[PDB]
Amino acid sequence: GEWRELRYDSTCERLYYGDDEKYFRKPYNFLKYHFEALADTGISSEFYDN
């Protein structure tokens, strides 16, 4: 999932994605890596005036 930074080619005017070296070998001791993505930004603001 992290092989998505950037990749460009000026000679052929080819702009493509992170296809180079995109594979992660799982080290028997690991059941599964289960790539996923979730980003939850929670802001709790309570302004009180007395």
Binding site: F35, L38, A39, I43, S44, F47, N50
Partner: protein, 49 residues
């Protein structure tokens, strides 16, 4: 001749005023799905648009 005058005066006044007001606002976001830099820029907690 007999003459005697009596005068008595008293004043009282009190004024009081009090005011209190508060206002609280919150905003929470929830995003699920996206690993590239797109979701990273979208994960900015700082304008829900």
């Amino acid at each position: 001749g007999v003459s005697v005058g009596k005068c008595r005066g008293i004043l009282n006044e009190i004024k009081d005023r009090n005011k209190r007001d508060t206002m609280v606002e919150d905003l929470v976001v929830l995003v699920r799905g996206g690993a590239s830099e797109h979701i990273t820029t979208l994960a900015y907690q700082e304008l829900p648009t």
